[PDB]
PDB file of C-alpha atoms in Angstrom:
ATOM      1  CA  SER A   1      -6.008 -14.898  16.754  1.00 10.62           C
ATOM      2  CA  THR A   2      -7.374 -12.406  14.079  1.00  8.82           C
ATOM      3  CA  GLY A   3      -7.869  -8.665  13.804  1.00 13.76           C
ATOM      4  CA  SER A   4     -10.042  -6.636  11.510  1.00 11.55           C
ATOM      5  CA  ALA A   5      -9.802  -3.027  10.817  1.00 11.01           C
ATOM      6  CA  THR A   6     -11.188  -0.283   8.810  1.00  6.44           C
ATOM      7  CA  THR A   7      -8.981   1.406   6.292  1.00  4.63           C
ATOM      8  CA  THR A   8     -10.150   5.113   5.152  1.00  5.90           C
ATOM      9  CA  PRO A   9      -9.116   7.172   2.058  1.00  5.52           C
ATOM     10  CA  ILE A  10      -7.274  10.243   3.183  1.00  4.85           C
ATOM     11  CA  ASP A  11      -8.845  12.323   0.685  1.00  2.00           C
ATOM     12  CA  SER A  12     -11.468  12.448  -2.261  1.00  2.00           C
ATOM     13  CA  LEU A  13      -9.079  10.863  -4.891  1.00  2.00           C
ATOM     14  CA  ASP A  14      -7.937   7.911  -2.721  1.00  2.00           C
ATOM     15  CA  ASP A  15      -4.243   9.146  -2.718  1.00  2.00           C
ATOM     16  CA  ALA A  16      -3.785   6.766   0.316  1.00  2.00           C
ATOM     17  CA  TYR A  17      -5.574   4.864   2.980  1.00  2.00           C
ATOM     18  CA  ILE A  18      -5.204   5.345   6.686  1.00  2.00           C
ATOM     19  CA  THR A  19      -5.934   2.681   9.311  1.00  2.00           C
ATOM     20  CA  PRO A  20      -5.864   3.359  13.242  1.00  2.00           C
ATOM     21  CA  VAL A  21      -3.167   1.552  15.155  1.00  4.01           C
ATOM     22  CA  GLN A  22      -2.917   1.200  18.806  1.00  2.00           C
ATOM     23  CA  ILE A  23       0.706   1.827  20.360  1.00  2.00           C
ATOM     24  CA  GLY A  24       1.727   1.697  23.807  1.00  2.00           C
ATOM     25  CA  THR A  25       0.097   1.570  27.166  1.00  2.00           C
ATOM     26  CA  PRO A  26      -2.239   3.300  27.674  1.00  2.00           C
ATOM     27  CA  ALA A  27      -2.746   3.092  23.980  1.00  2.00           C
ATOM     28  CA  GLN A  28      -1.818   5.909  21.692  1.00  2.00           C
ATOM     29  CA  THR A  29      -3.791   5.713  18.443  1.00  2.00           C
ATOM     30  CA  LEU A  30      -2.053   6.901  15.341  1.00  2.00           C
ATOM     31  CA  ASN A  31      -3.351   6.585  11.731  1.00  2.00           C
ATOM     32  CA  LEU A  32      -0.938   4.651   9.684  1.00  2.00           C
ATOM     33  CA  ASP A  33      -0.415   3.948   5.950  1.00  2.00           C
ATOM     34  CA  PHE A  34      -0.472   0.302   5.559  1.00  2.00           C
ATOM     35  CA  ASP A  35       2.266  -0.559   2.826  1.00  2.00           C
ATOM     36  CA  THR A  36       2.629  -3.986   1.320  1.00  2.00           C
ATOM     37  CA  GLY A  37       5.642  -2.257  -0.515  1.00  2.00           C
ATOM     38  CA  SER A  38       7.970  -1.650   2.441  1.00  2.00           C
ATOM     39  CA  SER A  39       8.835  -3.194   5.768  1.00  2.72           C
ATOM     40  CA  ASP A  40       9.212  -0.504   8.338  1.00  4.07           C
ATOM     41  CA  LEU A  41       6.574   0.506  10.900  1.00  4.46           C
ATOM     42  CA  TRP A  42       7.653   4.139  11.603  1.00  5.17           C
ATOM     43  CA  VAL A  43       5.732   6.969  13.180  1.00  6.02           C
ATOM     44  CA  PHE A  44       5.850  10.660  13.818  1.00  4.88           C
ATOM     45  CA  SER A  45       6.879  11.050  17.475  1.00  6.82           C
ATOM     46  CA  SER A  46       7.827  13.396  20.219  1.00 10.13           C
ATOM     47  CA  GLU A  47      11.468  13.080  18.932  1.00  8.74           C
ATOM     48  CA  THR A  48      10.546  14.180  15.428  1.00 10.20           C
ATOM     49  CA  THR A  49      12.135  17.578  14.664  1.00  9.77           C
ATOM     50  CA  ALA A  50       9.567  20.107  15.512  1.00 13.55           C
ATOM     51  CA  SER A  51       9.678  22.215  12.255  1.00 13.81           C
ATOM     52  CA  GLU A  52       8.919  18.848  10.459  1.00 11.24           C
ATOM     53  CA  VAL A  53       5.410  18.171  12.270  1.00 11.96           C
ATOM     54  CA  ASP A  54       2.272  19.836  10.938  1.00 11.17           C
ATOM     55  CA  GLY A  55      -0.839  18.349  12.283  1.00  9.73           C
ATOM     56  CA  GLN A  56       0.121  14.811  12.665  1.00 12.47           C
ATOM     57  CA  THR A  57      -0.625  12.668  15.684  1.00 11.69           C
ATOM     58  CA  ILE A  58       2.661  11.734  17.498  1.00 16.77           C
ATOM     59  CA  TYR A  59       3.806   8.820  19.431  1.00 20.68           C
ATOM     60  CA  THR A  60       5.385   9.671  22.692  1.00 22.35           C
ATOM     61  CA  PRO A  61       7.327   6.897  23.982  1.00 24.39           C
ATOM     62  CA  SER A  62       7.855   8.376  27.491  1.00 20.52           C
ATOM     63  CA  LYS A  63       4.319   8.053  28.048  1.00 18.91           C
ATOM     64  CA  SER A  64       4.163   4.270  27.443  1.00 22.70           C
ATOM     65  CA  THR A  65       4.673   2.006  30.184  1.00 22.85           C
ATOM     66  CA  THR A  66       5.563  -0.853  27.683  1.00 21.56           C
ATOM     67  CA  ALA A  67       7.803   0.997  25.464  1.00 22.36           C
ATOM     68  CA  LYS A  68      11.531   0.063  25.671  1.00 20.90           C
ATOM     69  CA  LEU A  69      14.633   1.709  23.877  1.00 19.18           C
ATOM     70  CA  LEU A  70      16.006  -0.803  21.372  1.00 19.48           C
ATOM     71  CA  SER A  71      19.519   0.467  22.261  1.00 17.36           C
ATOM     72  CA  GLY A  72      21.772   1.414  19.463  1.00 18.89           C
ATOM     73  CA  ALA A  73      19.239   0.900  16.835  1.00 18.13           C
ATOM     74  CA  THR A  74      18.622   3.263  13.910  1.00 19.97           C
ATOM     75  CA  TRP A  75      16.726   3.267  10.874  1.00 21.34           C
ATOM     76  CA  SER A  76      16.734   5.351   7.654  1.00 21.74           C
ATOM     77  CA  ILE A  77      14.423   4.671   4.562  1.00 24.35           C
ATOM     78  CA  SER A  78      13.816   6.166   1.320  1.00 24.47           C
ATOM     79  CA  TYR A  79      10.799   5.542  -0.995  1.00 24.49           C
ATOM     80  CA  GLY A  80      10.053   5.273  -4.496  1.00 25.81           C
ATOM     81  CA  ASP A  81       8.464   8.635  -4.741  1.00 25.05           C
ATOM     82  CA  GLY A  82      11.561  10.289  -3.517  1.00 23.72           C
ATOM     83  CA  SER A  83      10.365  10.705   0.272  1.00 26.96           C
ATOM     84  CA  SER A  84      12.370   9.547   3.287  1.00 29.41           C
ATOM     85  CA  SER A  85      12.608   9.242   7.179  1.00 31.72           C
ATOM     86  CA  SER A  86      14.819   8.160   9.745  1.00 36.12           C
ATOM     87  CA  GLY A  87      15.297   7.893  13.395  1.00 35.35           C
ATOM     88  CA  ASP A  88      15.752   5.530  16.384  1.00 33.50           C
ATOM     89  CA  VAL A  89      13.671   2.526  17.549  1.00 34.37           C
ATOM     90  CA  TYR A  90      11.570   1.397  20.610  1.00 36.20           C
ATOM     91  CA  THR A  91       9.669  -1.933  21.132  1.00 36.78           C
ATOM     92  CA  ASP A  92       6.134  -1.641  22.327  1.00 38.87           C
ATOM     93  CA  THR A  93       2.764  -3.130  22.305  1.00 40.80           C
ATOM     94  CA  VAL A  94       0.926  -2.567  18.754  1.00 41.83           C
ATOM     95  CA  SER A  95      -2.580  -3.636  18.168  1.00 45.20           C
ATOM     96  CA  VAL A  96      -4.598  -3.643  14.859  1.00 46.28           C
ATOM     97  CA  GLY A  97      -8.097  -4.200  14.968  1.00 51.15           C
ATOM     98  CA  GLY A  98      -8.223  -6.453  17.958  1.00 51.57           C
ATOM     99  CA  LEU A  99      -4.855  -8.082  17.227  1.00 51.31           C
ATOM    100  CA  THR A 100      -1.986  -7.430  19.587  1.00 49.37           C
ATOM    101  CA  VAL A 101       1.810  -7.859  19.007  1.00 46.60           C
ATOM    102  CA  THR A 102       4.177  -7.224  22.031  1.00 48.39           C
ATOM    103  CA  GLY A 103       7.658  -6.345  21.352  1.00 50.94           C
ATOM    104  CA  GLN A 104       6.916  -4.718  18.114  1.00 51.44           C
ATOM    105  CA  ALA A 105       9.737  -2.354  16.763  1.00 51.27           C
ATOM    106  CA  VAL A 106       8.134   0.909  16.485  1.00 52.76           C
ATOM    107  CA  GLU A 107      10.599   3.086  14.564  1.00 49.79           C
ATOM    108  CA  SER A 108      10.298   6.711  15.780  1.00 49.50           C
ATOM    109  CA  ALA A 109      11.133   9.265  13.369  1.00 49.05           C
ATOM    110  CA  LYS A 110      13.717  11.953  14.262  1.00 47.26           C
ATOM    111  CA  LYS A 111      13.634  13.499  10.773  1.00 46.60           C
ATOM    112  CA  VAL A 112      10.994  13.247   7.803  1.00 44.06           C
ATOM    113  CA  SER A 113      10.805  14.458   4.493  1.00 47.89           C
ATOM    114  CA  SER A 114       8.660  17.309   3.365  1.00 48.36           C
ATOM    115  CA  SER A 115       6.144  15.264   1.446  1.00 48.23           C
ATOM    116  CA  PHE A 116       5.394  13.603   5.006  1.00 46.56           C
ATOM    117  CA  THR A 117       5.198  16.888   6.756  1.00 45.69           C
ATOM    118  CA  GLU A 118       2.919  18.088   4.089  1.00 46.73           C
ATOM    119  CA  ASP A 119       0.560  15.255   4.717  1.00 43.88           C
ATOM    120  CA  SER A 120      -1.217  15.938   7.902  1.00 40.87           C
ATOM    121  CA  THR A 121      -3.425  12.880   7.746  1.00 43.46           C
ATOM    122  CA  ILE A 122      -0.689  10.223   7.792  1.00 45.56           C
ATOM    123  CA  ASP A 123       1.073   9.692  11.197  1.00 46.23           C
ATOM    124  CA  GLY A 124       3.475   6.937   9.850  1.00 44.51           C
ATOM    125  CA  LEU A 125       3.589   3.770   7.838  1.00 42.48           C
ATOM    126  CA  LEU A 126       3.092   0.178   8.691  1.00 43.59           C
ATOM    127  CA  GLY A 127       4.954  -1.945   6.492  1.00 43.39           C
ATOM    128  CA  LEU A 128       3.696  -5.351   5.055  1.00 45.24           C
ATOM    129  CA  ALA A 129       6.142  -6.539   2.722  1.00 45.19           C
ATOM    130  CA  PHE A 130       8.972  -9.088   3.720  1.00 47.33           C
ATOM    131  CA  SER A 131      11.036  -8.401   6.680  1.00 46.85           C
ATOM    132  CA  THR A 132      14.047  -8.693   4.736  1.00 46.80           C
ATOM    133  CA  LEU A 133      13.575  -5.166   3.505  1.00 49.64           C
ATOM    134  CA  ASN A 134      13.380  -3.668   7.015  1.00 50.36           C
ATOM    135  CA  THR A 135      16.002  -0.909   7.465  1.00 47.29           C
ATOM    136  CA  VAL A 136      16.797  -1.318  11.303  1.00 45.91           C
ATOM    137  CA  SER A 137      20.351  -1.542  11.966  1.00 47.38           C
ATOM    138  CA  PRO A 138      22.409  -3.429  13.462  1.00 52.12           C
ATOM    139  CA  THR A 139      19.615  -5.940  13.909  1.00 49.63           C
ATOM    140  CA  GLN A 140      16.865  -6.155  11.424  1.00 48.58           C
ATOM    141  CA  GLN A 141      13.385  -6.196  12.832  1.00 49.98           C
ATOM    142  CA  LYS A 142      10.100  -7.931  11.889  1.00 50.70           C
ATOM    143  CA  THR A 143       7.100  -6.477  10.376  1.00 53.86           C
ATOM    144  CA  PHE A 144       3.812  -6.450  12.373  1.00 53.79           C
ATOM    145  CA  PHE A 145       2.333  -9.356  10.237  1.00 56.12           C
ATOM    146  CA  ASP A 146       5.664 -11.414  10.787  1.00 56.38           C
ATOM    147  CA  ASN A 147       5.344 -11.145  14.450  1.00 54.94           C
ATOM    148  CA  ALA A 148       1.789 -11.950  14.523  1.00 52.54           C
ATOM    149  CA  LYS A 149       2.001 -14.788  11.981  1.00 51.43           C
ATOM    150  CA  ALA A 150       2.501 -17.609  14.398  1.00 51.43           C
ATOM    151  CA  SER A 151      -0.411 -16.622  16.543  1.00 53.65           C
ATOM    152  CA  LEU A 152      -2.943 -16.123  13.546  1.00 52.37           C
ATOM    153  CA  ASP A 153      -5.564 -18.709  12.751  1.00 51.57           C
ATOM    154  CA  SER A 154      -4.243 -18.634   9.375  1.00 50.37           C
ATOM    155  CA  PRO A 155      -0.874 -16.886   8.324  1.00 49.13           C
ATOM    156  CA  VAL A 156      -2.558 -14.376   5.941  1.00 47.94           C
ATOM    157  CA  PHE A 157      -3.935 -10.930   5.730  1.00 47.51           C
ATOM    158  CA  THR A 158      -6.278  -9.387   3.215  1.00 48.44           C
ATOM    159  CA  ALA A 159      -6.618  -5.982   1.486  1.00 50.93           C
ATOM    160  CA  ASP A 160     -10.154  -5.009   0.516  1.00 46.52           C
ATOM    161  CA  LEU A 161      -9.581  -1.160  -0.447  1.00 46.48           C
ATOM    162  CA  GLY A 162     -12.689   0.790  -1.445  1.00 46.05           C
ATOM    163  CA  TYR A 163     -13.197   3.227  -4.283  1.00 46.49           C
ATOM    164  CA  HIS A 164     -14.138   6.501  -2.797  1.00 47.16           C
ATOM    165  CA  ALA A 165     -14.986   4.418   0.297  1.00 47.02           C
ATOM    166  CA  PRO A 166     -13.649   2.728   3.293  1.00 49.20           C
ATOM    167  CA  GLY A 167     -12.271  -0.837   3.217  1.00 50.11           C
ATOM    168  CA  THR A 168     -10.941  -3.292   5.436  1.00 49.68           C
ATOM    169  CA  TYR A 169      -7.489  -5.162   6.336  1.00 48.74           C
ATOM    170  CA  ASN A 170      -7.953  -8.315   8.053  1.00 50.06           C
ATOM    171  CA  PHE A 171      -5.446 -10.643   9.867  1.00 50.80           C
ATOM    172  CA  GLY A 172      -5.524 -14.116  10.280  1.00 48.00           C
ATOM    173  CA  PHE A 173      -8.755 -15.037   8.390  1.00 47.42           C
ATOM    174  CA  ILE A 174     -10.339 -14.815   5.035  1.00 45.44           C
ATOM    175  CA  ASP A 175     -13.798 -13.101   5.037  1.00 43.96           C
ATOM    176  CA  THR A 176     -15.753 -15.206   2.491  1.00 47.85           C
ATOM    177  CA  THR A 177     -18.797 -12.489   2.472  1.00 46.15           C
ATOM    178  CA  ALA A 178     -16.428 -10.011   1.049  1.00 43.51           C
ATOM    179  CA  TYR A 179     -15.845 -11.133  -2.436  1.00 45.42           C
ATOM    180  CA  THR A 180     -17.785 -12.631  -5.384  1.00 41.32           C
ATOM    181  CA  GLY A 181     -16.687 -15.829  -7.191  1.00 42.61           C
ATOM    182  CA  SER A 182     -13.478 -17.578  -6.055  1.00 41.73           C
ATOM    183  CA  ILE A 183     -10.026 -16.425  -5.095  1.00 41.64           C
ATOM    184  CA  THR A 184      -7.335 -17.360  -7.827  1.00 43.16           C
ATOM    185  CA  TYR A 185      -4.037 -17.806  -6.238  1.00 44.54           C
ATOM    186  CA  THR A 186      -0.762 -17.067  -7.999  1.00 46.62           C
ATOM    187  CA  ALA A 187       2.969 -17.610  -7.188  1.00 49.90           C
ATOM    188  CA  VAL A 188       5.219 -14.983  -5.491  1.00 50.28           C
ATOM    189  CA  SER A 189       8.767 -14.269  -5.604  1.00 49.48           C
ATOM    190  CA  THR A 190      10.213 -12.864  -2.348  1.00 47.96           C
ATOM    191  CA  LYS A 191      13.632 -12.332  -4.009  1.00 49.35           C
ATOM    192  CA  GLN A 192      13.350  -8.491  -3.851  1.00 47.44           C
ATOM    193  CA  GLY A 193      11.383  -8.509  -0.711  1.00 45.08           C
ATOM    194  CA  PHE A 194       8.153  -7.760  -2.456  1.00 44.69           C
ATOM    195  CA  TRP A 195       4.881  -9.451  -2.885  1.00 44.37           C
ATOM    196  CA  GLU A 196       6.123 -10.036  -6.457  1.00 46.56           C
ATOM    197  CA  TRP A 197       3.853 -11.861  -8.864  1.00 46.58           C
ATOM    198  CA  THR A 198       3.375 -12.273 -12.706  1.00 44.44           C
ATOM    199  CA  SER A 199      -0.085 -11.083 -14.343  1.00 45.23           C
ATOM    200  CA  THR A 200      -1.074 -12.993 -17.272  1.00 46.01           C
ATOM    201  CA  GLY A 201      -2.097 -10.062 -19.344  1.00 45.82           C
ATOM    202  CA  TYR A 202      -4.579  -7.166 -19.999  1.00 47.27           C
ATOM    203  CA  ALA A 203      -7.272  -5.846 -21.875  1.00 41.67           C
ATOM    204  CA  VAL A 204      -8.370  -2.400 -22.505  1.00 43.77           C
ATOM    205  CA  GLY A 205     -12.376  -1.679 -22.129  1.00 46.44           C
ATOM    206  CA  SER A 206     -14.044  -4.066 -24.328  1.00 44.10           C
ATOM    207  CA  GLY A 207     -11.037  -5.202 -26.164  1.00 43.84           C
ATOM    208  CA  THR A 208      -9.662  -8.628 -26.639  1.00 46.70           C
ATOM    209  CA  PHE A 209      -7.271  -9.901 -23.984  1.00 48.73           C
ATOM    210  CA  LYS A 210      -3.614  -9.945 -24.831  1.00 48.71           C
ATOM    211  CA  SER A 211      -1.697 -12.845 -23.103  1.00 51.25           C
ATOM    212  CA  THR A 212       1.548 -11.588 -21.927  1.00 51.23           C
ATOM    213  CA  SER A 213       3.638 -11.805 -18.682  1.00 51.90           C
ATOM    214  CA  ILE A 214       3.749  -8.728 -16.515  1.00 53.40           C
ATOM    215  CA  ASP A 215       6.110  -9.018 -13.401  1.00 54.47           C
ATOM    216  CA  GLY A 216       5.078  -6.634 -10.625  1.00 55.44           C
ATOM    217  CA  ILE A 217       4.490  -5.976  -6.917  1.00 53.71           C
ATOM    218  CA  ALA A 218       0.978  -5.782  -5.084  1.00 53.63           C
ATOM    219  CA  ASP A 219       1.763  -2.619  -3.311  1.00 52.55           C
ATOM    220  CA  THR A 220      -0.768  -0.816  -1.042  1.00 47.95           C
ATOM    221  CA  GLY A 221       1.304   1.845  -0.421  1.00 51.77           C
ATOM    222  CA  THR A 222       1.459   3.245  -4.055  1.00 49.67           C
ATOM    223  CA  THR A 223      -1.487   5.151  -5.307  1.00 50.59           C
ATOM    224  CA  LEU A 224      -1.442   4.415  -9.176  1.00 50.29           C
ATOM    225  CA  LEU A 225      -0.957   1.503 -11.460  1.00 48.09           C
ATOM    226  CA  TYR A 226       2.418   1.552 -13.096  1.00 48.48           C
ATOM    227  CA  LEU A 227       2.779  -0.883 -16.092  1.00 47.78           C
ATOM    228  CA  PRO A 228       5.117  -1.099 -19.056  1.00 45.30           C
ATOM    229  CA  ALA A 229       5.003   1.774 -21.606  1.00 47.45           C
ATOM    230  CA  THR A 230       3.524  -0.380 -24.255  1.00 50.03           C
ATOM    231  CA  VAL A 231       0.501  -1.375 -22.052  1.00 50.41           C
ATOM    232  CA  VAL A 232       0.017   2.172 -20.814  1.00 48.06           C
ATOM    233  CA  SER A 233       0.384   3.530 -24.327  1.00 47.40           C
ATOM    234  CA  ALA A 234      -2.262   0.895 -25.590  1.00 49.94           C
ATOM    235  CA  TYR A 235      -4.553   1.894 -22.832  1.00 50.30           C
ATOM    236  CA  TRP A 236      -4.460   5.715 -23.274  1.00 48.95           C
ATOM    237  CA  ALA A 237      -4.746   5.464 -27.077  1.00 46.42           C
ATOM    238  CA  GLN A 238      -8.364   4.545 -26.425  1.00 47.10           C
ATOM    239  CA  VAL A 239      -9.113   7.744 -24.717  1.00 46.30           C
ATOM    240  CA  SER A 240     -10.025  10.815 -26.852  1.00 52.20           C
ATOM    241  CA  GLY A 241      -7.518  13.594 -26.363  1.00 51.49           C
ATOM    242  CA  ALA A 242      -5.345  11.889 -23.880  1.00 50.92           C
ATOM    243  CA  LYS A 243      -1.424  12.518 -24.074  1.00 52.71           C
ATOM    244  CA  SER A 244       1.728  12.068 -22.145  1.00 53.96           C
ATOM    245  CA  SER A 245       2.774  15.124 -20.627  1.00 52.29           C
ATOM    246  CA  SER A 246       6.377  15.695 -19.602  1.00 56.65           C
ATOM    247  CA  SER A 247       5.648  18.775 -17.942  1.00 55.23           C
ATOM    248  CA  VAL A 248       2.911  17.224 -15.958  1.00 53.45           C
ATOM    249  CA  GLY A 249       5.117  13.738 -15.497  1.00 52.98           C
ATOM    250  CA  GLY A 250       2.590  11.360 -17.013  1.00 54.89           C
ATOM    251  CA  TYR A 251      -0.650  10.845 -18.982  1.00 56.90           C
ATOM    252  CA  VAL A 252      -3.305  13.436 -18.782  1.00 56.38           C
ATOM    253  CA  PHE A 253      -6.851  13.524 -20.365  1.00 58.33           C
ATOM    254  CA  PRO A 254      -9.694  15.766 -20.603  1.00 57.80           C
ATOM    255  CA  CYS A 255     -12.096  15.232 -18.100  1.00 60.49           C
ATOM    256  CA  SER A 256     -14.979  15.303 -20.584  1.00 61.86           C
ATOM    257  CA  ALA A 257     -13.419  11.984 -21.954  1.00 60.86           C
ATOM    258  CA  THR A 258     -14.794   8.577 -21.029  1.00 63.28           C
ATOM    259  CA  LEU A 259     -12.315   6.121 -19.561  1.00 64.41           C
ATOM    260  CA  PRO A 260     -12.447   2.605 -20.611  1.00 64.88           C
ATOM    261  CA  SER A 261     -11.979  -0.301 -18.096  1.00 63.88           C
ATOM    262  CA  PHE A 262      -8.595  -2.094 -17.762  1.00 64.68           C
ATOM    263  CA  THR A 263      -8.480  -5.889 -16.992  1.00 62.87           C
ATOM    264  CA  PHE A 264      -5.570  -7.720 -15.785  1.00 63.19           C
ATOM    265  CA  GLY A 265      -5.124 -11.337 -15.403  1.00 62.27           C
ATOM    266  CA  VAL A 266      -4.552 -13.452 -12.524  1.00 62.18           C
ATOM    267  CA  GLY A 267      -3.845 -16.898 -13.818  1.00 61.76           C
ATOM    268  CA  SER A 268      -7.039 -17.740 -16.073  1.00 61.19           C
ATOM    269  CA  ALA A 269      -9.060 -15.257 -13.956  1.00 63.05           C
ATOM    270  CA  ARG A 270      -9.629 -11.549 -14.583  1.00 64.94           C
ATOM    271  CA  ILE A 271      -9.801  -8.497 -12.573  1.00 62.29           C
ATOM    272  CA  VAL A 272     -11.546  -5.591 -14.127  1.00 59.42           C
ATOM    273  CA  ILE A 273     -10.626  -1.991 -13.028  1.00 56.38           C
ATOM    274  CA  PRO A 274     -13.701   0.221 -13.814  1.00 58.14           C
ATOM    275  CA  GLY A 275     -12.727   3.328 -15.937  1.00 57.84           C
ATOM    276  CA  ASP A 276     -13.909   5.539 -12.978  1.00 60.42           C
ATOM    277  CA  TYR A 277     -11.031   4.122 -10.838  1.00 62.12           C
ATOM    278  CA  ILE A 278      -8.444   5.554 -13.353  1.00 63.55           C
ATOM    279  CA  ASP A 279      -9.498   9.247 -12.998  1.00 61.59           C
ATOM    280  CA  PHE A 280      -7.507  11.375 -10.473  1.00 60.99           C
ATOM    281  CA  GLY A 281      -8.879  14.542 -11.291  1.00 64.62           C
ATOM    282  CA  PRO A 282      -7.597  17.950 -12.356  1.00 64.57           C
ATOM    283  CA  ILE A 283      -3.930  18.351 -12.514  1.00 64.76           C
ATOM    284  CA  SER A 284      -4.400  21.764 -10.776  1.00 62.57           C
ATOM    285  CA  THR A 285      -7.485  23.345  -9.273  1.00 65.24           C
ATOM    286  CA  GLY A 286      -9.554  24.481 -12.073  1.00 63.96           C
ATOM    287  CA  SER A 287      -7.943  22.735 -14.854  1.00 65.33           C
ATOM    288  CA  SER A 288      -9.763  20.790 -17.699  1.00 67.87           C
ATOM    289  CA  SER A 289      -6.828  18.472 -17.766  1.00 68.56           C
ATOM    290  CA  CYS A 290      -7.092  15.212 -15.561  1.00 69.64           C
ATOM    291  CA  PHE A 291      -4.458  13.163 -14.186  1.00 72.53           C
ATOM    292  CA  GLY A 292      -4.451   9.293 -15.096  1.00 71.19           C
ATOM    293  CA  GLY A 293      -4.375   6.451 -12.805  1.00 71.72           C
ATOM    294  CA  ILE A 294      -2.484   4.430 -14.980  1.00 68.95           C
ATOM    295  CA  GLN A 295       0.945   5.350 -15.825  1.00 68.46           C
ATOM    296  CA  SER A 296       4.433   3.991 -17.328  1.00 67.60           C
ATOM    297  CA  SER A 297       6.768   2.106 -15.034  1.00 69.12           C
ATOM    298  CA  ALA A 298       9.734   2.858 -17.327  1.00 66.76           C
ATOM    299  CA  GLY A 299      12.541   4.211 -15.105  1.00 66.68           C
ATOM    300  CA  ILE A 300      10.992   2.725 -11.945  1.00 62.71           C
ATOM    301  CA  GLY A 301      12.661  -0.508 -12.722  1.00 63.15           C
ATOM    302  CA  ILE A 302       9.605  -2.383 -11.470  1.00 63.65           C
ATOM    303  CA  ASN A 303       5.816  -2.539 -12.280  1.00 62.41           C
ATOM    304  CA  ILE A 304       3.299  -1.590  -9.641  1.00 66.26           C
ATOM    305  CA  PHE A 305       0.106  -2.796  -8.959  1.00 66.29           C
ATOM    306  CA  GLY A 306      -0.852   0.103  -6.660  1.00 66.09           C
ATOM    307  CA  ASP A 307      -4.254   0.856  -5.147  1.00 68.08           C
ATOM    308  CA  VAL A 308      -5.862   1.596  -8.587  1.00 66.41           C
ATOM    309  CA  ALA A 309      -5.558  -1.949  -9.323  1.00 66.28           C
ATOM    310  CA  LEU A 310      -5.782  -3.541  -5.675  1.00 67.84           C
ATOM    311  CA  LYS A 311      -9.033  -1.655  -4.707  1.00 68.79           C
ATOM    312  CA  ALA A 312     -10.862  -3.517  -7.659  1.00 66.70           C
ATOM    313  CA  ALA A 313     -10.070  -6.971  -6.013  1.00 63.94           C
ATOM    314  CA  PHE A 314     -10.202  -8.639  -2.703  1.00 66.41           C
ATOM    315  CA  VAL A 315      -6.576  -9.533  -2.119  1.00 67.43           C
ATOM    316  CA  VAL A 316      -4.987 -12.292  -0.047  1.00 68.06           C
ATOM    317  CA  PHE A 317      -1.431 -11.953   1.241  1.00 69.21           C
ATOM    318  CA  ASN A 318      -0.542 -15.507   2.017  1.00 68.48           C
ATOM    319  CA  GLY A 319       2.200 -15.728   4.226  1.00 68.53           C
ATOM    320  CA  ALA A 320       2.443 -19.659   4.273  1.00 69.68           C
ATOM    321  CA  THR A 321       5.995 -21.108   4.194  1.00 72.09           C
ATOM    322  CA  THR A 322       5.801 -20.693   0.312  1.00 71.37           C
ATOM    323  CA  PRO A 323       3.879 -17.209   0.026  1.00 69.48           C
ATOM    324  CA  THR A 324       1.151 -16.745  -2.499  1.00 68.44           C
ATOM    325  CA  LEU A 325      -1.067 -13.981  -3.553  1.00 67.13           C
ATOM    326  CA  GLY A 326      -4.777 -14.402  -4.082  1.00 67.73           C
ATOM    327  CA  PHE A 327      -7.107 -12.221  -6.044  1.00 69.91           C
ATOM    328  CA  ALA A 328     -11.037 -12.174  -6.168  1.00 69.37           C
ATOM    329  CA  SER A 329     -13.427  -9.879  -7.962  1.00 70.50           C
ATOM    330  CA  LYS A 330     -15.897  -8.201  -5.313  1.00 72.39           C
TER     331      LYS A 330
END
């Protein structure tokens, strides 16, 4: 089997991408944030505290003839950005772009933190990291990909995120028309439950390539590119007027400035992030200070190849017995 779904930016900055997901019988379609940095499929629901729902589409298990309570199961998650949610669990039929999993754990939110409430466009998350990170207790549950894997034509999914435009998540096949050149594959460590890999280095604009190992995660659920402070400083040093603002919480720059591209290494191959991808617009409405899309990972404890990086590539998440990551230009 295969599946193919369009993923759409939630706003003009590509702060996140939403993908429609069919849950239950008859189908209830929710727009979920596909997150290769986490491993829970959780949704706004009829069980979510009413005051914490503000425009989201909810899953109502009682209206699904295929929903079954996962008796005794609870879940609770906190994300790197300080947001969180928690609740109980149903199993139900979940379909993504034509691909159907029966018996998928659908984690129903009883509580969500303010950032989720305040984002009317995201109805929940669909985790695509390794199932070892799943928070369901007492019995850890499998991700949608883990459940589908054995049925897929090939045990892979691909992320093709757009810059200020829709893109595509495919399951079970590699669309050879969706990228240029070849796909370079690189090793993955699953020891922290992430799609964790090592970039071979970087370049700033037309500058020479610096060969240096940068361990990080391929995370579709993180907006920006977070790299070591040395790397980030070297980038913003090439932007006139750029500075790190403690009050704002990262590097800012005058919008009149031209942003250089940023290249990262995948083996001997190179992915070029165009400068425009690194512009996240005014820090506040009307401000001449723009927020940068490359920021320091210091104090996160891990480097994160988030959407800024991934949307410059066609990315293969290869769930073979020994997982690997593939990157192509496009």
